[model samples]
Target: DVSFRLSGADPSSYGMFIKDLRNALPHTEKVYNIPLLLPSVSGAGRYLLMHLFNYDGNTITVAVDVTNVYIMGYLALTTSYFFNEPAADLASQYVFRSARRKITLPYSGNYERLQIAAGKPREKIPIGLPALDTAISTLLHYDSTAAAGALLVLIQTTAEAARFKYIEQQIQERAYRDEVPSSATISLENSWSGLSKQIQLAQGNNGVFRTPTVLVDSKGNRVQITNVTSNVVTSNIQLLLNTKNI
Candidate 1:
């Protein structure tokens, strides 16, 4: 018999979800469950696995060094006991990242660790929708083979669109949502038309499918052809790999 256990600050809902998962899966194959632990801490114990449902949620507030080293990582590997097929909602989408450095927590401010990067991604970062929708549209409009070129073109387009969309939404929803007390709506209206221009440019330049296209940025962060689209930092790759809906 296979026993399942889930531990989280969340209520039994988390464990129950796992139970339902087990029920949905077939039992013809062998499976293994691993325990979570910390390095040097020894034995089995509850360890922190900091996970942001969206990569957009990494944040911290403090100066350079802090004694308390917070090593965070996330593991998501969808498994089906009866079959190797991935689950609905692309549950089989696996994401893994390594935790760096050894955290020595002696006490409050006594411990010290290397500098860590913090903060949510800038609001300017575009969300990958156009590219995603284009891919979906192409796949549906044509066969999977036709989707091949559409996929790549959409990949580059999606990355850039996502980048710009991020910024656009940030501006419209947050930045330009209201007129200032100093001026009537018309003064603020000045900035509104610019959005249309930007959107038009994005649609015209990026909305099309083309290879050799990339995620370009004025910040010089883009360093390679693939740099045009930072696969690591964006969701384009994941969207293309998603075959569940098909």
Candidate 2:
């Protein structure tokens, strides 16, 4: 069941409240694989999960997933967090970022729902407007902090949601983690500050960053197209973003 109340808009219409959410988050092994639905809010939406791995000792690395709940999670991350524009965080917080951008992920909503309810096991609807990757670029291209901030909010929310579930199912989860050399767990605040430092280093050093990107064809089938740098970004000192373009 969906926990948070997701607004009925995409990219620009996302909204929420985080009160009392801190008590629910619980984790270990650091990494958290959050199951989610994309475009749509439930199973009817494309099933996509996000992986978030907060590396050890003043470092942060997020990956990606969720069954379908991950979809809503991912959507909220994209629209509310990423698209929502952190600059606007200084202003009125009433309107949704997606709504301001006028973007909608639900393309002919019912048609997509029909596909999921039927035998369709994959995404098939062509994005009616600028979607997923394009939308992200539109908003965060010039603003990298917003992108980082988006990841921060999503990871925190996932931790909270997973924690809520953990209390119920006692099923421990790990897709990403925050740790020290000995795999020691650190507070979210610590990780956040660490992330801030690294991002700043990235800017001063040209930023070694990667985004989760997917390509959707006219038929709506998708494939990940982003090249993930592992060894190059394994550590804070290894954030090889100095010379060449990322």
Candidate 3:
């Protein structure tokens, strides 16, 4: 079983920690699908999980489950080494990056309870924040790495909330353009109209990117939205607005 305390002056730092941890552990074929969550400690706001995988190697393919227990102020971790594994070394390297932090090592008694409850399945909650979910899904799956990088910039800007609003507005305009036929082509009577008349009719422009746009967030997460799919924009915009209120 593994447990670690996570505390920072900034609450957002917890979000950063989760993002970084996901990055450090590459999602591969060997990786398990959903993580297994264990029961929390009394009075502790804890997010605990166990991730089992076979670390691919020649002859030394170690099958292990890494327990990650992240509480508001502490983290504790313990590993069960199997098949001639180097438990101590792996724990030191994978579990802790630095020896300097005010981190508490896992006590045997607390870890034993988690270990006993290892196989219990946790209920999955639906992602209620539509905008946040869409943006994250796009960043990790739909958008390319370069596009994701580009999208991250907008999130860091002072006008980050406004940027989401812009996307939403553009998307609404695009949706309207799709639903209604252009005035220029609406009537056959205007088909043979003069060039100047046609030009004037077509002069109005929708303020949306003609091509797909990549937007980066403060966390360097990126998302790409096509001009036709305003849902992504609206979803992300709603998320930003909701976050601000919170």
Residue 12 CA error for candidate 3 (Å)?
A: 1.7
Q: TM-score of each candidate?
A: 0.17, 0.21, 0.18
Which whole-number lDDT from 0 to 100 does residue 160 have in model 1? Answer: 22
Q: State the lDDT of candidate 2 residue by residue for 145-169, as single tens digits.
A: 3333333334334332332322111
Ranking by lDDT: 2, 3, 1
* Candidate 3 minimal-lDDT segment of 10 residues: 52-61
* Sequence-dependent TM-score of model 2: 0.21
1 against 3, candidate with superior TM-score: 3
lDDT of 1 at 108: 21
- What's the residue-level lDDT of 87 in candidate 2? 21
The CA lDDT at 135 in model 2 is 24
lDDT winner between 1 and 2, please give it: 2
Cα lDDT for residue 115, candidate 3: 27
Find the candidate with the highest lDDT and give its number: 2
